[PDB]
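Model the whole thing, not chain by chain.
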Amino acid sequence: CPPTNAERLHEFHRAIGATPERPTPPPPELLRLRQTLLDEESAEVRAEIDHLLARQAAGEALSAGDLAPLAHELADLLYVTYGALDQLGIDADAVFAEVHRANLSKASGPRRADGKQLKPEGWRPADVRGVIERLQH
Amino acid sequence: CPPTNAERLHEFHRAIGAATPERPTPPPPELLRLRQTLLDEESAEVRAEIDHLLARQAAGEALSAGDLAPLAHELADLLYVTYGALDQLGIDADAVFAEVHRANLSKASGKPEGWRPADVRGVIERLQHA
Ligand SMILES: O=c1ccn([C@H]2C[C@H](O)[C@@H](COP(=O)(O)O)O2)c(=O)[nH]1
Ligand SMILES: [Cl-]
Ligand SMILES: [Mg+2]
Ligand SMILES: [Mg+2]
């Protein structure tokens, strides 16, 4: 069992001499900081997606290597998203596992015109409250 | 050993019949547009939940661990669609994240002399040949 990306963030925060082991209500300034970071990386991802679409619209063919800047920015977005969960003292893997379980159960649902998977009749959402509760004991 | 979150996305896309290439693969524009839309949707929900928490705190509410559940759920949904973009591009998210992490952690050990920025182009080259 190698380290997860969530565990990596925990390692990173310690390394920079900075997070709780259990779910911990944050100060307002912490929430505002995490929002700022999400917005910054999100904007950089958007810029790269826009640029790839623009090159395609121009009639250019994309190589695999052309995807590097987008992949970098998506990983940066992962980094700050995991970063937020870690600062809240929330095990991202525990939450993600439950979100995943409920996502799997969408398979019989219809699809949106753009390709988004939608929810079938009778679908039940992930119980993330339940995850937070057992993480805090 | 549990699957990684990236590996979970592969399972999900296989289950719903969405594209999930084994190796890095230049996508059609339709795929890129969907990834942008999903990122925008989940980032808006995260923003909504952060805003709710802020507004409650401003009114003097003492937040409990349980109060973090909606935000935690939306942050995980944002991870989900971010991993999902990488998976649909056929790019191993764990390999790219590992390189970003190496760079970030390295930078904090200083900026060190001999530090090397994340080389994601290099990771993508190795993925093509694994
Ligand atoms: O095509 C899809 C549709 C949904 N999701 C995921 C991301 C989130 O975890 C969640 C959000 O879906 P909605 O609640 O917006 O329907 O399901 C995808 O990854 N791809
Ligand atoms: Cl696709
Ligand atoms: Mg960035
Ligand atoms: Mg959501």
